[PDB]
Amino acid sequence: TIPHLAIDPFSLDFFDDPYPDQQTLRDAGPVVYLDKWNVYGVARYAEVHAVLNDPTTFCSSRGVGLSDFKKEKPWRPPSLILEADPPAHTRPRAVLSKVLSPATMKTIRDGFAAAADAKVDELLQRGCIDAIADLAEAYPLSVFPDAMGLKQEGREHLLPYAGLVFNAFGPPNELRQTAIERSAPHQAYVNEQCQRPNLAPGGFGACIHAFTDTGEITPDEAPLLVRSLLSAGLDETVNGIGAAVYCLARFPGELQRLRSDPTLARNAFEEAVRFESPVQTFFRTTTREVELGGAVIGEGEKVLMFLGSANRDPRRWSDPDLYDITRKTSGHVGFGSGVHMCVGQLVARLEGEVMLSALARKVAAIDIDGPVKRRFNNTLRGLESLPVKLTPA
Numbered sequence: 001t002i003p004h005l006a007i008d009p010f011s012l013d014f015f016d017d018p019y020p021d022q023q024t025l026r027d028a029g030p031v032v033y034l035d036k037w038n039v040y041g042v043a044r045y046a047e048v049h050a051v052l053n054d055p056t057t058f059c060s061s062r063g064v065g066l067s068d069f070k071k072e073k074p075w076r077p078p079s080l081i082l083e084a085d086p087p088a089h090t091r092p093r094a095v096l097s098k099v100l101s102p103a104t105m106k107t108i109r110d111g112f113a114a115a116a117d118a119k120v121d122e123l124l125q126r127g128c129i130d131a132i133a134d135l136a137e138a139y140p141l142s143v144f145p146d147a148m149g150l151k152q153e154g155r156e157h158l159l160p161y162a163g164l165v166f167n168a169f170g171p172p173n174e175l176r177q178t179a180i181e182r183s184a185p186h187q188a189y190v191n192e193q194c195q196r197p198n199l200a201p202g203g204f205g206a207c208i209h210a211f212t213d214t215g216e217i218t219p220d221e222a223p224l225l226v227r228s229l230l231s232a233g234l235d236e237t238v239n240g241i242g243a244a245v246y247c248l249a250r251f252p253g254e255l256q257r258l259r260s261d262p263t264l265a266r267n268a269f270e271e272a273v274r275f276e277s278p279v280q281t282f283f284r285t286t287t288r289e290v291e292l293g294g295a296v297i298g299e300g301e302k303v304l305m306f307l308g309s310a311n312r313d314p315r316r317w318s319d320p321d322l323y324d325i326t327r328k329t330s331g332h333v334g335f336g337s338g339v340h341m342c343v344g345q346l347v348a349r350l351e352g353e354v355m356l357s358a359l360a361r362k363v364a365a366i367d368i369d370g371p372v373k374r375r376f377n378n379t380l381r382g383l384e385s386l387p388v389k390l391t392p393a
C-alpha cells in the first residue's frame with residue numbers, strides 16, 4: 001500500500017533542484033518508503049503537521065537525524081531540548097523560552113536594528129556585493145555572538161560548527177562523514193564557551209546559567225543548554241535572510257510593495273522562511289506501530305518529514321511557488337510545530353525583520369549581477385554566493 005521510491009533526498013542532484021522531486025513525493029501518496037535509506041517519508045502538509053503534533057508516537061529522543069540513538073552512538077552528547085521528549089524536554093525548554101522571551105527582545109531590538117541599518121548603508125557605498133558573505137552571513141555574525149555574550153577569540157569556529165551540526169543529522173554520506181572527521185577543534189571551542197566563566201554577564205549564555213539558581217536546570221545541565229544556542233540559530237537565519245534577498249531580487253514587484261510599506265518587513269521575512277524553508281527535512285522515530293495516512297508504520301522506524309515540501313503543498317497553499325509578502329503565513333512549518341516549535345523564533349524574526357526593514361527604507365533595486373552558487377548541506381537549504389548590485393533609494 002506504501003509506494004517505494006528511489007529518490008535520494010540527500011543527493012546533490014536533489015539539493016540542486018528539489019521541487020520536481022517534492023511533487024513526486026507528495027503525489028505518490030501520503031506516506032512513502034525511501035529504499036535508498038530504509039526510512040518512511042511524508043511530504044504533504046497534513047501528514048507533516050500531524051507527525052510534528054504527535055510527539056508520543058513520533059518521538060525525538062531517539063534522534064531527529066537518520067541515526068537511531070537506540071542503535072548507534074550519537075556523535076556528540078544528545079541535546080537536552082532538541083533530542084528529548086516530554087517530560088525531560090519541558091524544563092530545559094522553559095529556560096530557553098524565558099531566555100529568548102518577548103521581554104528579552106526589548107533589550108536587544110535597538111542594537112539589532114542599528115546594526116542592520118548600518119550594514120545596509122555600508123553595502124550601498126560599495127554597490128556590488130555578495131549578499132551571502134557580505135550581508136546574510138555578516139549581519140547575524142555582527143549581533144548574535146555579542147548577544148550570546150561570547151568572547152572575541154575563537155568565533156571563527158561558529159559557522160563550521162553550525163554546518164557540522166546540520167550535516168550530522170543526515171545519512172552517512174560524504175557530506176556527513178567529511179564533517180564529523182577532524183571536527184574535534186570545533187567541538188572543543190564550543191564546549192569551552194559553554195562554561196559559565198566564559199560568558200559575558202547579561203548575555204544569553206550567562207542568563208541560562210543564572211537559571212540554575214531556580215531549580216529549572218542543574219549547574220551540570222547549563223553547559224549543554226548553552227550549546228544548543230551555539231548549534232542552532234546561525235546557519236538557518238543566514239540562509240533565511242539570503243533567501244529573502246534572493247526573492248526580492250527575483251520578484252521585483254514584491255520589493256516595490258515592501259518599499260511602499262516597510263511595516264511588511266516582518267511578514268516579508270516570514271514568507272521567505274516558508275518559501276525557502278532553511279531547515280528542509282527533519283526526522284522522528286516511531287515508538288509504536290501507527291497508522292498514518294492509511295499506511296501502517298512499524299515501531300522503531302525513522303520517519304522523514306519534508307518541511308519545505310509541506311510549505312509548498314498546493315493542497316494547503318495557493319500559488320505555493322510564488323513569493324508573496326502579504327501572504328497569510330500562519331501555519332507554515334518552517335519553524336516546526338508543537339512542543340518543539342523553534343524556541344529561538346523571536347530572535348530569528350527580529351534579525352530578519354530589521355534587515356528587511358533597512359532594505360525597505362534604503363534600497364530601490366536589487367539586481368543579481370554575478371554567478372549564483374548553492375550551498376550544500378544534508379539538512380539546510382541556502383545559497384553560497386549571491387552577487388547583487390544594490391541601488392540606493
Ligand code: HEM
Pocket residue numbers: 060064081082083093096100228229232233234236237240273277278279282333334335336337339340341342343344345347348
Ligand atoms: C530562520 C531561522 C530558523 C529556522 C528555519 C529554524 C527552524 C527550526 C525548526 C524546524 C525547529 C523544530 C525542530 C523539531 O521539531 O525537531 C527548531 C527548533 C529549535 N530552534 Fe530554530 N530555527 C531558526 C532559528 C533559530 C534561532 C535564531 C535559534 C536560537 C536563538 C534557534 C534555536 C532552536 C532550538 C534550541 C530549537 C529546539 C527547540 C525544541 O526542541 O523545543 N532556532 N528550529
Ligand SMILES: CSc1ccc(C(=O)O)cc1
Pocket residue numbers: 079080081082083165227228229231232279
Ligand atoms: C532544529 S535545528 C537545531 C535545534 C536545536 C539544536 C540543539 O539543541 O543543539 C540543534 C539544532
Ligand SMILES: [Cl-]
Pocket residue numbers: 076186187188190191
Ligand atoms: Cl560539541
